[PDB]
Amino acid sequence: QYNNQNNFV
Amino acid sequence: QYNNQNNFV
Amino acid sequence: QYNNQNNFV
């Protein structure tokens, strides 16, 4: 299981 | 299972 | 299962 999340402001 | 989410403001 | 979502503002 590969879980990825990223936020760029 | 591959789970991906990204936000670009 | 491949799950993908991305938001570009």
Next chain:
Amino acid sequence: QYNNQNNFV
């Protein structure tokens, strides 16, 4: 199962 959604503003 391939699930894809993207939003471009």
Next chain:
Amino acid sequence: QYNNQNNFV
């Protein structure tokens, strides 16, 4: 099953 949806504003 291939599920695709995209929005371009």
Next chain:
Amino acid sequence: QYNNQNNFV
């Protein structure tokens, strides 16, 4: 099974 979709704005 070959599944292909592309969007060009």
Next chain:
Amino acid sequence: QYNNQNNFV
């Protein structure tokens, strides 16, 4: 199974 999707803005 080959699954491909690309978006070009």
Next chain:
Amino acid sequence: QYNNQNNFV
């Protein structure tokens, strides 16, 4: 199974 998705803004 080959799963590919790319976004170009």
Next chain:
Amino acid sequence: QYNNQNNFV
């Protein structure tokens, strides 16, 4: 299984 996703802003 080959899983690939890339975002270019």
Next chain:
Amino acid sequence: QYNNQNNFV
């Protein structure tokens, strides 16, 4: 299993 994701701002 090969899992790859990259973001370029």
